[PDB]
């Protein structure tokens, strides 16, 4: 039946991934506390970032059992990075630091999500998809909200739920070209 994750299971699996981020010096420094626009002198910050996130807040969420399942933790991690890549310029120190944190995260999260029964821990598709030649802006919980182009955006890798345990798994990870699931997808664990 439906998998429920208890707080201590999520904390013990995931916290090392967050620690790996905190370990980065200088890179984690701008991410260790909530952005304070007065202190930092950036009064436009909450004009651009509608839903702030930082390492301390994620830590507090883990410590207090605020995540019901681990994709929610992954989403906050990417909300944090996506906010910073939005607010800050590509040539800025804080943007480059953010890209380093994301690299570290990508390398840490997969075996840890695998230990929790998931296919992997990866949020985004690997490449932009080929194209054919206001309010709360919610496409995705990690996408910073909004109130001529380059085709370099990544979409979230789409999910299918296991009908037995209720875990969200990637379509591209668990659905294969030569297998059909007439009665709905069941993950290998639950099989």
């Amino acid at each position: 039946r439906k998998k429920i994750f208890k707080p201590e299971e999520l904390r013990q699996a995931l916290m090392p991934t967050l620690e790996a981020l905190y370990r980065q010096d200088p890179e984690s420094l701008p991410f260790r506390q909530p952005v304070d626009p007065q202190l930092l002198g950036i009064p436009d910050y909450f004009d651009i970032v509608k839903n702030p996130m930082d390492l301390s807040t994620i830590k507090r969420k883990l410590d207090t059992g605020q995540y019901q399942e681990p994709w929610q933790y992954v989403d906050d991690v990417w909300l944090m990075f996506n906010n910073a890549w939005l607010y800050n310029r590509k040539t800025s120190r804080v943007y480059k630091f953010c890209s380093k944190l994301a690299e570290v995260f990508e390398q840490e999260i997969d075996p840890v999500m695998q230990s929790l029964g998931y296919c992997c821990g990866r949020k985004y598709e690997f490449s932009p998809q080929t194209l054919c030649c206001n309010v709360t802006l919610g496409d995705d919980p990690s996408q910073p909200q909004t109130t001529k182009k380059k085709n370099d955006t990544l979409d979230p890798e789409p999910f299918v739920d296991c009908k037995e345990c209720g875990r969200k798994m990637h379509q591209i990870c668990v659905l294969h070209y030569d297998i059909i699931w007439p009665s709905g997808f069941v993950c290998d664990n639950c099989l």
């Binding site: 701008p30 930092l40 002198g41 950036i42 436009d44 004009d47 800050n88 310029r89 800025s92 804080v94």
Partner: peptide, 6 residues
């Protein structure tokens, strides 16, 4: 578009 930076 982009913020005043930090």
């Amino acid at each position: 578009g982009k913020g005043l930076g930090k």
